[PDB]
Symmetry: D2
Subunit: 363 residues, 4 copies
């Protein structure tokens, strides 16, 4: 019942300012923080050898795209390796990002581990020495971080244990980040795997996010200096029932309104298994949803910003600009989407929508 402030007013201002820069109007996040193991599958899909130089070149391709991406990209999440790589002109990648108006982010979790006594559920590791890592990352140009927890919808999952433990470890990570001037992006990802329907995803998302914010409260987290990186509320990948984008938008915004305090500066959706176009259309629908939304609703996209660029590249240096063009097209699309101004087939305000239509009490 007694306060022992975790942060000074100055520390709070720093975190809040960073958080707001990342999700400024029209801006979102490029999630480029795939580990060597994670990106292996991406490079194999284009017959490209998973070498440090090819990883460097691919990240260079994204980070040095032309200035059209600048008002689209408020932040870039990097993997450790990339944080210490340089572009062809000798500039460290953090400097490249900053010169284009982006905030530099660093993924700091050390992956998932199995929870014994559960049906294949996990928590996430990475807290050991995290404070010192954050202090160093801060010095080396990073101002925010990312940590991924993974939950699965199944017959008996997510379990009480999995929800409580993942919420708790997210809070520890967030606490340590804020002590070191790093804005934590809290990523409690509920996988879309399975044949569950939209209502079930909405229910599980509501319960998971309630647990997350109670844990953040218990650990004295300054919400204004955080971002949330959740799944959209969608049917399961194998669900037999089909839904519209407006229904997905309504389920998502309702789940967030029921759980995320207004003090949270922004929500930066992960794209999950969604295609590039699907992720953009859904984000647009979310931003056109006629409910009050007291936080930025924008993107933290990996595959949904990268899929076409990677394919266009094909591992060939001669395809640089063609690949970059595909990335710029998705950056532009999603920048419009996070303002509710994205039209898929067109561009000239040729997308009129629905009002006075549909109950929000079915959600």
């Amino acid at each position: 019942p007694h306060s022992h402030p975790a942060l000074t007013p100055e520390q709070k201002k720093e975190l809040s300012d960073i958080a707001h820069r990342i999700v400024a109007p029209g801006k979102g996040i490029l999630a480029a923080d795939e580990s060597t193991g994670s990106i292996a599958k991406r490079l194999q899909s284009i017959g490209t050898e998973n070498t440090e130089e090819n990883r460097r070149f691919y990240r260079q391709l994204l980070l040095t795209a032309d200035d059209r991406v600048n008002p689209c990209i408020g932040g870039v999440i990097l993997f450790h390796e990339t944080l210490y790589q340089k572009a062809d002109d000798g500039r460290p990648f953090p400097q490249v990002i900053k010169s284009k108006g982006g905030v530099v982010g660093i993924k700091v979790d050390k992956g998932v581990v199995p929870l014994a006594g559960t049906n294949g559920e996990t928590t996430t590791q990475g807290l050991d020495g995290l404070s010192e890592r954050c202090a160093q990352y801060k010095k080396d140009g990073a101002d925010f971080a990312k940590w991924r927890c993974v939950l699965k919808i199944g017959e008996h999952t997510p379990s009480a244990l999995a929800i409580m433990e993942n919420a708790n470890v997210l809070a520890r990570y967030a606490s340590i980040c804020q002590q070191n001037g790093i804005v934590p992006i809290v990523e409690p990802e509920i996988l879309p795997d399975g044949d569950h329907d939209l209502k079930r995803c909405q229910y599980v998302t509501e319960k998971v996010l309630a647990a997350v914010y109670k844990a953040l409260s218990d650990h004295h987290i300054y919400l204004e200096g955080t971002l949330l990186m959740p799944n959209m509320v969608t049917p399961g990948h194998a669900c037999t029932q089909k839904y519209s984008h407006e229904e997905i938008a309504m389920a998502t915004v309702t789940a967030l309104r029921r759980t995320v305090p207004p003090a949270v500066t922004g929500v930066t959706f992960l794209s999950g298994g969604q295609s590039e176009e699907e992720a953009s259309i859904n984000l647009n629908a979310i931003n056109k949803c006629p409910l009050l939304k007291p936080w930025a609703l924008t993107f933290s996209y990996g595959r949904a910003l990268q899929a076409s660029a990677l394919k266009a590249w094909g591992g060939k240096k001669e395809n640089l600009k063609a690949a970059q063009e595909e990335y710029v097209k998705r950056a532009l699309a999603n920048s419009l989407a996070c303002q509710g101004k994205y039209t898929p087939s067109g561009q000239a305000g040729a997308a009129a929508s629905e009002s006075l239509f549909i109950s929000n009490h079915a959600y």
Copy 2:
């Protein structure tokens, strides 16, 4: 991990519609739900015998005030006795309230009880047979309810037990209400008693409200079909440090933004120990606070609507109009305040731009 819906879409729509009517723009709540024991000391202060007829006459005085109060009063909380009393013309008081555009409320708790093993802390009783009581009250014209929990700021309070238990019983009460078509007002009152400062009240309010909304989540409460009735965030009564109304406002709105999901339809402040004018000025400042506020911010006032009326009445029938005039004046003032339009002058403002120097990172 599996939903077993507490409410149908139709039940949800009913609750949401009621909650929104209560806190519609310009409207707040008259809290007239004092028990015989509670109002006794109020009648003694004006030398009036605490009889059923004098209580009836007093409640009639408030409820039958002229039509100027109609746009000011969205709801009226009654004590059980009053719910079944009639005006002089034979009209049930609920009908009187409804004819003036008000929603009828009923207090359903059975008072506080001591928590053993604590330093004088309490929980609140009243769950037994509550469902049947709610069904009866609904039939007899009530559409919302009130339940008061009380917490104290002290050397060791509020304790973990007190916070958890009061949050839990509020959730049970809210669950039972919603099963019977009654909108629950959740009232976790943190008393202003003591010499603690503004920061301490804000800290405790934040921890209490986080506990409250986690419990409501655990018990499957439909937030859109609820209201919150909290203390404003103020220094303790015996605090020597002085604060402006803008500081009280910032602390209050900050605490709510950090804990209350946007889905909550409205916040209806209790006036506590504040004077009539103090309570209007603070509510107005709260509504002028330049942060995003995704819920109605209005009043649920007892003393702050009734004090001058009670005094002007003095127990004398000939002072009816004078007493009513005092009540009407406070209803008008607070109707303005809950829109941020209260000026100490007779409805005359437009001096709305002269705010500059206060950090929200100091809160």
Copy 3:
């Protein structure tokens, strides 16, 4: 982190002394606390009208059995009505019980109520005015109380909510009892309904009991002044797999060893749907289990003490001694069983072998 003792050393001694008397070696509890609704249909089973007089006569039959029962019966749980009834000789039933060396107990819960948003789960009501009720019951000769919570094993049950809420209300009930010199018997009954196996029941019993004792800790309950009244660990009623009494004993004792602190004075098993003979044999096996058991392991039997007596009586005054004889046979058997000294031989009636199981039909 600061103690505010709920109880004085004198209060602790009184409660500890009472608890130990109830479960003194060789002794158990007659659970005769069936409400009018509960006792009604068994009275129907022998064509007897459910009148106050017939209920009184039946209770007299049990309570005034000959002195062979005295060393078997440490306590008797009464329903409110019976607490204020008198034997034919004018003696209040509490006086009758005490004169035979028994402690008088009173059931104080007010039945189960549905938890909204669950699959047919309940919590239990009865806290309102419980303190005053306990003080009065204490004056009128009761020294312990009973409160029944009910949980069910199913695909999604018991849920996190049901476990937490039932554990919490048990703790509130225990707290209030101990403030008034009443030893609370904590009864978290996990129903045997369903086709689950022994392992599943053991798992659920362990999770439920861990929740119960954490809640009792949080609410500052003095464990030495309590008793526990749980289900034995058994397969579900409809389980096809067969188990020995030694396996039932091992699962039961293991579940308790993993969850019940040694400070708990005694465990008084409910018989659930077991026959008179099965309940005795299992209790015997439990006491013979070769693991360390730092609490009394005895009976709190209703039907399993009463079935043969009720049938032998048949509602006929002339069959008094015959009926009493059946009850005495069962008290003696279970007195031996709670010492691990019961061997059946020559020979219990067919009434003592028939399943006493009725499905829990809120359905």
Copy 4:
């Protein structure tokens, strides 16, 4: 509500067997797991350079003490460095320990870290890669582990956060250990620092241990395959009120009886700031306490086994035998103490047919 067994029966039997060997009658644990940083001040106290060789020689001195220690020492906790060192004759230290009948243990935490927003409270780190470390340690001869959490009694401490978080991380550590055939010793140390009295230590110890065992339950920990390493319940170092060894014993055993399930195989007390003789006398009083104690109550002593030996050694190879003799004397003393047969003076005793005491409800 559904079991997904963390362990097979075979895995359980292995863990239980190990746990029981460590705390077999008359046996305790030598805690020799000081890090380089931790042992530094003790080597300085005898003017000895903190080098790997001097550390090796000192550990060798302890581990190769003569065979009188064999029936006294059921286990030895090593620091990582020491697990991979060899005696002069080339035998790995794990082989030395095992040949004398001891189980080899390994400390696996990575020290305390500050909890932001608290008054100087900590949690403990070390989960990252812990599974792989445990598998490696198992292969390299360790069968149990130790993990130290630290809590402090102060005006506002231990806080709800600190208790919750330390209990949770202890449970994670325990889970990972048991997946790898390693018995976890759970060490929630409440420091003796401060001027608090015996009752306060007892209260905090009860609350901490209740939290620890709820967390172990939530994480599916197999208690029979664990040990507990708690503080004894004592007044704070600066407390002016004086207590007898019998009062310390009663408070300690009462606290454990109220919180530690019988299934826990043993309690191995840390000696904290107690002197060699004090720690032995208190352990003896604990084992003579006339309450039922369903777990082994023995020692896990660092300083209380090493102080005189370290002093006699003085960093001088020439003092090997003298130093070993001091260690052997404390090993003998504590073996008697954990059997309740230690007399604090020289040679003459054994006339005890003791223990069934007057006081009990003052605690």
